């Protein structure tokens, strides 16, 4: 199966390489300027993983819209402002490195 | 209305004998290739479904097509109590009660059942309640009737587990004041590049006062005031030519200690105005997503 | 009226000694005969107070004439059944 | 409102909210004592003030089975016309569209 | 978690065309039982 | 400690009363609510008041059309004065019954002209009239009318109960608490916790406020809270209240 | 009145006795007069000879005896006593001083001793405990046998057909001979006692040139057997032997305290240890015992043994040589090559029921062996020759586990007396609940449904709607159970084209092994078949083509429907959904005054009221004397015509009486006086039935047409004319009682002459304590006069003040009668007074 | 910050010991912290603002 | 619906405010008797019964509102002080 590091982005220093099961569906193709935190595959994404780059204004918009996706296929409509009030609660803490 | 019922009120569409003709053509060639030995019994076990499962849907659509032309006041049904009503079409079009699936069991066919395991019955049961179902054909109809009260024994239990987590946390998330002290710069700029890959929506911008004065292309006196509300019509102008970043006061961009002002939020949704001081947007937001 | 803030702190034997009036040594509870608690027992009236309204366990003070006076023979004050 | 009988009569149009049928169900009723609650019962607890849906924004209370039947009956035509003409005498068939 | 209400009623549910959007019907005898502490408060002021 | 025993029965002739449920053999579940007078009750030509008016509202979802061969055939069987033997998965036929319907009285389709007893104008499109085999199911006592206002209370628990002669109070479940908090109320939330259950000294004082036509003051401190202070006190930890 | 019929489809057989299952089965346990020693005798063969060896004492069983009951029959219904009959067994105890029953001198022996007492069966077949009759319903479970399941993971092992071998004796042992490579061979014993299997075969006399030298050639997956033996590269034979080769001494090496040595090591696994003085400390469990045999002389564990395995060796295994370990390992390899022995989990042919007859056995044994723990306690206190009579065995212990079953179990419920028809249907069901091992609450989507094999066995229609769907069901019309367990259904046999009219009852065991055709199949004269594509089935698999493969066909089409769902008019026009919602509500019916037979029927409503035993049936010819609406007496002609000498057989006509669920069970005399009647003739019709068929409800007219909104959701208006004729009148009936007590103040008494200050309590009570029958008032009155003095007949000074305002008249005694509870009152039926009767009252 | 908060949910045997040592003077600002003591709701209709 | 109820929520730019406007004052009118109510008897509900009018209700007093006034502790401190209220019999 494929190796690399989940589509290892090549920079101007020293790249990195790991491994990942073949049970992953491809989403992003070649020739795409993608940074850290942006979902590469499909489905849910580790909140603690994207937390390293996204920060707050980005990690929040993701979890809010992601939930609005499953309620989108159903047919019911609900304003995302009902989630932006409960997600902010997870922004009360901040560990010190 | 004078709606009633009779022995001849259960008429059957003539389109039924038109959709079975094309079906018999395939059936008259499914056993022929079976007796030869070129087609396994398993090959014809999943092919009979890909022809009858689509033959019981077109029959219902071809029927209602006639009950909306020369006559519509046609009266069908039987003689029982529930929530529906006579005129099998008048109530189905009014949006009262009567799905194409249920109606099918009165003027159309019976459809395809299902085995207790997961497979599907071979020989279909076209025989309707009009002529009467055979003893053997009725033995299979009892198998698919067990899948009804078995897939809803979870949602009727307690689907309020979702709201069981939010309320016990956002119980302190309530409006504390009208105006905090934040400027217009450091906030939240909802980009148009969101979702799975790129599927924007008016939902996010729906009801929220803008912050900075976005300079949008066009003639003079076109810019949007940095102190005005946002209506469903006002947003249609934004997501039409801008397609850029829009500075707007959000909830997670509030600068206060425990709470969110009225401006940082938006509409009330419950009525038709701005959220009033006292709206527990931390409790109602949990039930609004817990009940669906 | 209403409640404001709540204070919490460890408990010391010096403080617990204040609320308490004595120590129980006899595991025995009450009697099935006269329905009277045992002396220095679990349900002793010497420390936990009287059982009935304005009356000891023996029978020295019954009438309401005594608003509240300890007995020289019993050693139990005269109060209601609420302070139990 | 007082009514002769041993049952609780419920509004038909509000049945869409309680999602219950009159087949033999059962419902309990509470009664406010304090005046303060009596005021709130006519402020937000009442039904005449909660017409729209908190989630989306569309009217939750809508015609059911009978109330919609009477309206769809009175509002009925026949369509299936030809085009446009002078037509002053001859046709005149009921109230066709 | 659960506190029993001192004043509550319960019975079979029926329909009522006479009722309005902001109205609800209820049993006759149940009215006396529910508003018991209240009905006595008015009877004294009256002549009953 | 008993001399002798005296047994006395109590036979009760329960008569028809709006509140029970009726269902035949097909599953036509229903319920009587209002008794339709005879004055405003339409009839046929010869003048025959309807024994009971059903409800033509609900059929396609049941999918049990079969009692038709019992209504129409039952009407013709009366006019001819004969029992019908129909086995299972067989018996009569649409063409066989239709031929029998030829006799009877006069009709043959089932739809007879119905004259309105209210306005007087004949109902457009005649309705069907025949005999239906129904049944009156027993009225369970689990749906009896119950209502409580005042009752006894415990000691340490101090909550509304329900004896024999007295009814029981509906326990305000937590499921109805959050639904109230959503509105953003106040006083109507603290009441369903204190006076109306736990609070004792605030329950008696309130009873002496709506009797003279006055108003009840604010509740006090819950009993399940002032005892917890002692419950936790015996755990090697000291708790003390404090105002501002 | 001409009777025009349509269809007929003549049947070669009629509906068997619906109450045949719960009748013959219970008659195979008691064994009183008919048989000699079989059923009940088997129960005394398990407990006896009970041996409490403590020196020289032995108790041997001889025979049983069933004499007369405790007292009268009509007396245990007004006190709550289970009508039964004590038993008498013979005991032969011996004392250390050589005192065994065999002589007349120094040899004492008793023969008649009554302690235990078991209930009996009467007419219909329903027990009666504590007044309320109890009925036992048989349950369905998977019959114990050798099956073949699967196992997740592994994907690189051995075993039987698939992997882990799973057998289920009954309690003996769960023999597991799986194979795990690498090093240690995976072998269990009873739980998970892990140990090398390389030394096991060595104990059964097998060298290193048998299992790993003549089996490794066909498979190189013996990495678990080539570990202990250590057969690396070909080297010097002798002087290089290990555990495998040698047998007695065995190699003495192992990284631990103890040391392995094959034979003398199987016990070393249990710390600490003990000398080889116990050659049979556990091996005596896998031999002569109830371990192997799952039933008496393998009467049940026979079909599921020699059919899959090889043969059979004695009831158990034996001494050293064990053919129970070699006859099983030969299968794990046999199927591993190519066979075909797969067992279906959800297969009716693998699950049988246990009727009341069988349930009465295992419940009588556990209650009898209970006294064993009491006959040893009274022995330590025994003197000399005084511990011979009934000074050991006790009645209470044995009469405890027997009364807690017929009134306190998962199979004992109250009969539904809401409808005479619902009565037989209540026993015509089989609950899937019972043993915790044979029944679990796991997710069985392919079990809680209907299987094609249920056609003719269990009605796929009559099933309790709700969460408990699929579990509880009902028996079909042509469905009867034999003396084994499985359900047997009639099936006509055929042999290549020709067809025999003669039917053939067959179980569900061979139902899947053979092919069954369809009843609605064409047939022209017995000899030739009229089709080349017979639509038949083959165990949950509808086959096709071939006419010689079949051997059985369906004789009746009614075999699919139950006994209660076959009374509804036109079933082919009814959906399986409403066909059930119309049956589960039918059993909740109630006898009404205005009851008449439906205008249309099927002809099965008559056979119901007969087998149910609702209407009175004469057992002898003769004329009728009286025809009272409460009592009917028929005189027979067996004795000379004499006013006081004849076969007087009064028929007690039950009037308005109580019921299990407050219903109405009355009978109306339909026979006049003078007209001679014979066997089969009905004397009086039942409650909810006219002439003896159905008649549960009634028929009314209807102007089918909506009514301005009033009929919103399931709302129905009813004409007032219906109420005028009071056609819907149901008698509920309750139960009140007054109990007198011996209070410290002073025992009160009931009398009409009460020193009360009123008269309201005198208007009713006039018949000396009691009151007349039938009247009318309201709730909150007096039923039985009570005079209980209070305050020690001493009034208080402060009390006289209150009554001094409202007429000073304070009597010593008051009226503390039982007032009518809240709700609705009613008339009285009967009145019973037992003022200390001379009978045996407690 | 409140001790009664986490006490009314998961893990309560821990917060009652951590707040006892330092002595936290928790104020009625939450929601469930009021339902247990009995007082006017610190929000909705009645708030500081 | 009801009388002058939707007019009180449209006149002022808030709904939660109108609550206490006719809550902490209404319940206070009963515990204080009826004399504190100085406005005329014009602004009063109407109850049809026995050809007369009783009770009183409220929601008709909200007219002259203001921002800052009294705290919140004195509302029932000097209220129950000036008037004790009770219940006596002859």
mmCIF file with all atom_site columns, N, CA and C in Angstrom, chain G residues 627-667:
data_model
loop_
_atom_site.group_PDB
_atom_site.id
_atom_site.type_symbol
_atom_site.label_atom_id
_atom_site.label_alt_id
_atom_site.label_comp_id
_atom_site.label_asym_id
_atom_site.label_entity_id
_atom_site.label_seq_id
_atom_site.pdbx_PDB_ins_code
_atom_site.Cartn_x
_atom_site.Cartn_y
_atom_site.Cartn_z
_atom_site.occupancy
_atom_site.B_iso_or_equiv
_atom_site.pdbx_formal_charge
_atom_site.auth_seq_id
_atom_site.auth_comp_id
_atom_site.auth_asym_id
_atom_site.auth_atom_id
_atom_site.pdbx_PDB_model_num
ATOM 1   N N  . UNK G 1 627 ? -85.732 -27.567 36.006 1.00 0.00 ? 627 UNK G N  1
ATOM 2   C CA . UNK G 1 627 ? -84.979 -26.731 35.078 1.00 0.00 ? 627 UNK G CA 1
ATOM 3   C C  . UNK G 1 627 ? -84.821 -25.310 35.612 1.00 0.00 ? 627 UNK G C  1
ATOM 4   N N  . UNK G 1 628 ? -84.529 -25.198 36.904 1.00 0.00 ? 628 UNK G N  1
ATOM 5   C CA . UNK G 1 628 ? -84.346 -23.897 37.538 1.00 0.00 ? 628 UNK G CA 1
ATOM 6   C C  . UNK G 1 628 ? -83.185 -23.140 36.899 1.00 0.00 ? 628 UNK G C  1
ATOM 7   N N  . UNK G 1 629 ? -83.263 -21.813 36.925 1.00 0.00 ? 629 UNK G N  1
ATOM 8   C CA . UNK G 1 629 ? -82.227 -20.973 36.336 1.00 0.00 ? 629 UNK G CA 1
ATOM 9   C C  . UNK G 1 629 ? -81.031 -20.821 37.271 1.00 0.00 ? 629 UNK G C  1
ATOM 10  N N  . UNK G 1 630 ? -80.873 -21.775 38.183 1.00 0.00 ? 630 UNK G N  1
ATOM 11  C CA . UNK G 1 630 ? -79.768 -21.750 39.134 1.00 0.00 ? 630 UNK G CA 1
ATOM 12  C C  . UNK G 1 630 ? -79.349 -23.161 39.533 1.00 0.00 ? 630 UNK G C  1
ATOM 13  N N  . UNK G 1 631 ? -80.159 -24.144 39.151 1.00 0.00 ? 631 UNK G N  1
ATOM 14  C CA . UNK G 1 631 ? -79.878 -25.539 39.475 1.00 0.00 ? 631 UNK G CA 1
ATOM 15  C C  . UNK G 1 631 ? -80.702 -26.488 38.610 1.00 0.00 ? 631 UNK G C  1
ATOM 16  N N  . UNK G 1 632 ? -80.039 -27.491 38.044 1.00 0.00 ? 632 UNK G N  1
ATOM 17  C CA . UNK G 1 632 ? -80.708 -28.473 37.199 1.00 0.00 ? 632 UNK G CA 1
ATOM 18  C C  . UNK G 1 632 ? -80.370 -29.891 37.644 1.00 0.00 ? 632 UNK G C  1
ATOM 19  N N  . UNK G 1 633 ? -81.400 -30.701 37.859 1.00 0.00 ? 633 UNK G N  1
ATOM 20  C CA . UNK G 1 633 ? -81.213 -32.074 38.316 1.00 0.00 ? 633 UNK G CA 1
ATOM 21  C C  . UNK G 1 633 ? -81.784 -33.082 37.324 1.00 0.00 ? 633 UNK G C  1
ATOM 22  N N  . UNK G 1 634 ? -80.957 -34.042 36.922 1.00 0.00 ? 634 UNK G N  1
ATOM 23  C CA . UNK G 1 634 ? -81.386 -35.092 36.005 1.00 0.00 ? 634 UNK G CA 1
ATOM 24  C C  . UNK G 1 634 ? -81.373 -36.454 36.691 1.00 0.00 ? 634 UNK G C  1
ATOM 25  N N  . UNK G 1 635 ? -82.507 -37.146 36.643 1.00 0.00 ? 635 UNK G N  1
ATOM 26  C CA . UNK G 1 635 ? -82.622 -38.468 37.248 1.00 0.00 ? 635 UNK G CA 1
ATOM 27  C C  . UNK G 1 635 ? -82.344 -39.564 36.224 1.00 0.00 ? 635 UNK G C  1
ATOM 28  N N  . UNK G 1 636 ? -81.493 -40.515 36.597 1.00 0.00 ? 636 UNK G N  1
ATOM 29  C CA . UNK G 1 636 ? -81.152 -41.628 35.718 1.00 0.00 ? 636 UNK G CA 1
ATOM 30  C C  . UNK G 1 636 ? -81.943 -42.880 36.080 1.00 0.00 ? 636 UNK G C  1
ATOM 31  N N  . UNK G 1 637 ? -81.934 -43.862 35.183 1.00 0.00 ? 637 UNK G N  1
ATOM 32  C CA . UNK G 1 637 ? -82.678 -45.098 35.395 1.00 0.00 ? 637 UNK G CA 1
ATOM 33  C C  . UNK G 1 637 ? -81.769 -46.297 35.643 1.00 0.00 ? 637 UNK G C  1
ATOM 34  N N  . UNK G 1 638 ? -81.007 -46.242 36.730 1.00 0.00 ? 638 UNK G N  1
ATOM 35  C CA . UNK G 1 638 ? -80.092 -47.323 37.078 1.00 0.00 ? 638 UNK G CA 1
ATOM 36  C C  . UNK G 1 638 ? -80.556 -48.062 38.328 1.00 0.00 ? 638 UNK G C  1
ATOM 37  N N  . UNK G 1 639 ? -81.486 -47.455 39.058 1.00 0.00 ? 639 UNK G N  1
ATOM 38  C CA . UNK G 1 639 ? -82.020 -48.054 40.275 1.00 0.00 ? 639 UNK G CA 1
ATOM 39  C C  . UNK G 1 639 ? -83.544 -48.046 40.252 1.00 0.00 ? 639 UNK G C  1
ATOM 40  N N  . UNK G 1 640 ? -84.149 -48.935 41.034 1.00 0.00 ? 640 UNK G N  1
ATOM 41  C CA . UNK G 1 640 ? -85.602 -49.028 41.114 1.00 0.00 ? 640 UNK G CA 1
ATOM 42  C C  . UNK G 1 640 ? -86.212 -47.674 41.464 1.00 0.00 ? 640 UNK G C  1
ATOM 43  N N  . UNK G 1 641 ? -87.350 -47.366 40.851 1.00 0.00 ? 641 UNK G N  1
ATOM 44  C CA . UNK G 1 641 ? -88.027 -46.093 41.076 1.00 0.00 ? 641 UNK G CA 1
ATOM 45  C C  . UNK G 1 641 ? -88.367 -45.892 42.549 1.00 0.00 ? 641 UNK G C  1
ATOM 46  N N  . UNK G 1 642 ? -87.565 -45.081 43.230 1.00 0.00 ? 642 UNK G N  1
ATOM 47  C CA . UNK G 1 642 ? -87.778 -44.801 44.644 1.00 0.00 ? 642 UNK G CA 1
ATOM 48  C C  . UNK G 1 642 ? -87.458 -43.344 44.961 1.00 0.00 ? 642 UNK G C  1
ATOM 49  N N  . UNK G 1 643 ? -88.330 -42.692 45.744 1.00 0.00 ? 643 UNK G N  1
ATOM 50  C CA . UNK G 1 643 ? -88.194 -41.276 46.108 1.00 0.00 ? 643 UNK G CA 1
ATOM 51  C C  . UNK G 1 643 ? -86.849 -40.952 46.754 1.00 0.00 ? 643 UNK G C  1
ATOM 52  N N  . UNK G 1 644 ? -86.226 -41.942 47.385 1.00 0.00 ? 644 UNK G N  1
ATOM 53  C CA . UNK G 1 644 ? -84.964 -41.728 48.069 1.00 0.00 ? 644 UNK G CA 1
ATOM 54  C C  . UNK G 1 644 ? -83.889 -42.731 47.696 1.00 0.00 ? 644 UNK G C  1
ATOM 55  N N  . UNK G 1 645 ? -84.094 -43.434 46.587 1.00 0.00 ? 645 UNK G N  1
ATOM 56  C CA . UNK G 1 645 ? -83.124 -44.418 46.119 1.00 0.00 ? 645 UNK G CA 1
ATOM 57  C C  . UNK G 1 645 ? -82.942 -44.351 44.606 1.00 0.00 ? 645 UNK G C  1
ATOM 58  N N  . UNK G 1 646 ? -81.993 -43.528 44.168 1.00 0.00 ? 646 UNK G N  1
ATOM 59  C CA . UNK G 1 646 ? -81.708 -43.370 42.747 1.00 0.00 ? 646 UNK G CA 1
ATOM 60  C C  . UNK G 1 646 ? -80.339 -42.732 42.535 1.00 0.00 ? 646 UNK G C  1
ATOM 61  N N  . UNK G 1 647 ? -79.932 -42.621 41.275 1.00 0.00 ? 647 UNK G N  1
ATOM 62  C CA . UNK G 1 647 ? -78.658 -42.012 40.938 1.00 0.00 ? 647 UNK G CA 1
ATOM 63  C C  . UNK G 1 647 ? -78.734 -40.497 40.939 1.00 0.00 ? 647 UNK G C  1
ATOM 64  N N  . UNK G 1 648 ? -78.871 -39.918 42.127 1.00 0.00 ? 648 UNK G N  1
ATOM 65  C CA . UNK G 1 648 ? -78.980 -38.471 42.267 1.00 0.00 ? 648 UNK G CA 1
ATOM 66  C C  . UNK G 1 648 ? -77.664 -37.777 41.930 1.00 0.00 ? 648 UNK G C  1
ATOM 67  N N  . UNK G 1 649 ? -77.636 -37.101 40.786 1.00 0.00 ? 649 UNK G N  1
ATOM 68  C CA . UNK G 1 649 ? -76.451 -36.369 40.355 1.00 0.00 ? 649 UNK G CA 1
ATOM 69  C C  . UNK G 1 649 ? -76.794 -34.911 40.073 1.00 0.00 ? 649 UNK G C  1
ATOM 70  N N  . UNK G 1 650 ? -76.852 -34.107 41.130 1.00 0.00 ? 650 UNK G N  1
ATOM 71  C CA . UNK G 1 650 ? -77.191 -32.694 41.002 1.00 0.00 ? 650 UNK G CA 1
ATOM 72  C C  . UNK G 1 650 ? -76.098 -31.932 40.256 1.00 0.00 ? 650 UNK G C  1
ATOM 73  N N  . UNK G 1 651 ? -76.512 -31.088 39.315 1.00 0.00 ? 651 UNK G N  1
ATOM 74  C CA . UNK G 1 651 ? -75.575 -30.286 38.538 1.00 0.00 ? 651 UNK G CA 1
ATOM 75  C C  . UNK G 1 651 ? -75.539 -28.850 39.046 1.00 0.00 ? 651 UNK G C  1
ATOM 76  N N  . UNK G 1 652 ? -74.531 -28.540 39.856 1.00 0.00 ? 652 UNK G N  1
ATOM 77  C CA . UNK G 1 652 ? -74.386 -27.204 40.423 1.00 0.00 ? 652 UNK G CA 1
ATOM 78  C C  . UNK G 1 652 ? -74.181 -26.128 39.361 1.00 0.00 ? 652 UNK G C  1
ATOM 79  N N  . UNK G 1 653 ? -75.231 -25.355 39.100 1.00 0.00 ? 653 UNK G N  1
ATOM 80  C CA . UNK G 1 653 ? -75.166 -24.280 38.118 1.00 0.00 ? 653 UNK G CA 1
ATOM 81  C C  . UNK G 1 653 ? -74.595 -23.018 38.754 1.00 0.00 ? 653 UNK G C  1
ATOM 82  N N  . UNK G 1 654 ? -73.340 -22.716 38.435 1.00 0.00 ? 654 UNK G N  1
ATOM 83  C CA . UNK G 1 654 ? -72.662 -21.554 38.999 1.00 0.00 ? 654 UNK G CA 1
ATOM 84  C C  . UNK G 1 654 ? -73.364 -20.251 38.629 1.00 0.00 ? 654 UNK G C  1
ATOM 85  N N  . UNK G 1 655 ? -73.911 -19.577 39.635 1.00 0.00 ? 655 UNK G N  1
ATOM 86  C CA . UNK G 1 655 ? -74.592 -18.305 39.429 1.00 0.00 ? 655 UNK G CA 1
ATOM 87  C C  . UNK G 1 655 ? -73.556 -17.184 39.411 1.00 0.00 ? 655 UNK G C  1
ATOM 88  N N  . UNK G 1 656 ? -73.987 -15.961 39.705 1.00 0.00 ? 656 UNK G N  1
ATOM 89  C CA . UNK G 1 656 ? -73.072 -14.825 39.754 1.00 0.00 ? 656 UNK G CA 1
ATOM 90  C C  . UNK G 1 656 ? -71.981 -15.046 40.797 1.00 0.00 ? 656 UNK G C  1
ATOM 91  N N  . UNK G 1 657 ? -70.782 -15.382 40.331 1.00 0.00 ? 657 UNK G N  1
ATOM 92  C CA . UNK G 1 657 ? -69.661 -15.651 41.222 1.00 0.00 ? 657 UNK G CA 1
ATOM 93  C C  . UNK G 1 657 ? -68.427 -14.849 40.818 1.00 0.00 ? 657 UNK G C  1
ATOM 94  N N  . UNK G 1 658 ? -67.406 -14.873 41.669 1.00 0.00 ? 658 UNK G N  1
ATOM 95  C CA . UNK G 1 658 ? -66.174 -14.133 41.418 1.00 0.00 ? 658 UNK G CA 1
ATOM 96  C C  . UNK G 1 658 ? -65.404 -14.679 40.219 1.00 0.00 ? 658 UNK G C  1
ATOM 97  N N  . UNK G 1 659 ? -64.248 -14.079 39.952 1.00 0.00 ? 659 UNK G N  1
ATOM 98  C CA . UNK G 1 659 ? -63.397 -14.496 38.845 1.00 0.00 ? 659 UNK G CA 1
ATOM 99  C C  . UNK G 1 659 ? -61.966 -14.019 39.068 1.00 0.00 ? 659 UNK G C  1
ATOM 100 N N  . UNK G 1 660 ? -61.029 -14.586 38.315 1.00 0.00 ? 660 UNK G N  1
ATOM 101 C CA . UNK G 1 660 ? -59.623 -14.218 38.438 1.00 0.00 ? 660 UNK G CA 1
ATOM 102 C C  . UNK G 1 660 ? -59.380 -12.743 38.128 1.00 0.00 ? 660 UNK G C  1
ATOM 103 N N  . UNK G 1 661 ? -60.103 -12.222 37.143 1.00 0.00 ? 661 UNK G N  1
ATOM 104 C CA . UNK G 1 661 ? -59.982 -10.817 36.768 1.00 0.00 ? 661 UNK G CA 1
ATOM 105 C C  . UNK G 1 661 ? -61.346 -10.135 36.737 1.00 0.00 ? 661 UNK G C  1
ATOM 106 N N  . UNK G 1 662 ? -62.077 -10.245 37.843 1.00 0.00 ? 662 UNK G N  1
ATOM 107 C CA . UNK G 1 662 ? -63.400 -9.635  37.984 1.00 0.00 ? 662 UNK G CA 1
ATOM 108 C C  . UNK G 1 662 ? -64.235 -9.620  36.703 1.00 0.00 ? 662 UNK G C  1
ATOM 109 N N  . UNK G 1 663 ? -64.585 -10.806 36.217 1.00 0.00 ? 663 UNK G N  1
ATOM 110 C CA . UNK G 1 663 ? -65.420 -10.931 35.028 1.00 0.00 ? 663 UNK G CA 1
ATOM 111 C C  . UNK G 1 663 ? -66.751 -11.597 35.366 1.00 0.00 ? 663 UNK G C  1
ATOM 112 N N  . UNK G 1 664 ? -67.510 -11.949 34.335 1.00 0.00 ? 664 UNK G N  1
ATOM 113 C CA . UNK G 1 664 ? -68.806 -12.592 34.523 1.00 0.00 ? 664 UNK G CA 1
ATOM 114 C C  . UNK G 1 664 ? -68.843 -13.972 33.877 1.00 0.00 ? 664 UNK G C  1
ATOM 115 N N  . UNK G 1 665 ? -68.953 -15.006 34.704 1.00 0.00 ? 665 UNK G N  1
ATOM 116 C CA . UNK G 1 665 ? -69.011 -16.378 34.212 1.00 0.00 ? 665 UNK G CA 1
ATOM 117 C C  . UNK G 1 665 ? -70.293 -17.077 34.665 1.00 0.00 ? 665 UNK G C  1
ATOM 118 N N  . UNK G 1 666 ? -71.360 -16.896 33.894 1.00 0.00 ? 666 UNK G N  1
ATOM 119 C CA . UNK G 1 666 ? -72.650 -17.498 34.210 1.00 0.00 ? 666 UNK G CA 1
ATOM 120 C C  . UNK G 1 666 ? -73.155 -18.402 33.091 1.00 0.00 ? 666 UNK G C  1
ATOM 121 N N  . UNK G 1 667 ? -74.138 -19.238 33.411 1.00 0.00 ? 667 UNK G N  1
ATOM 122 C CA . UNK G 1 667 ? -74.731 -20.136 32.427 1.00 0.00 ? 667 UNK G CA 1
ATOM 123 C C  . UNK G 1 667 ? -76.251 -20.015 32.419 1.00 0.00 ? 667 UNK G C  1
#
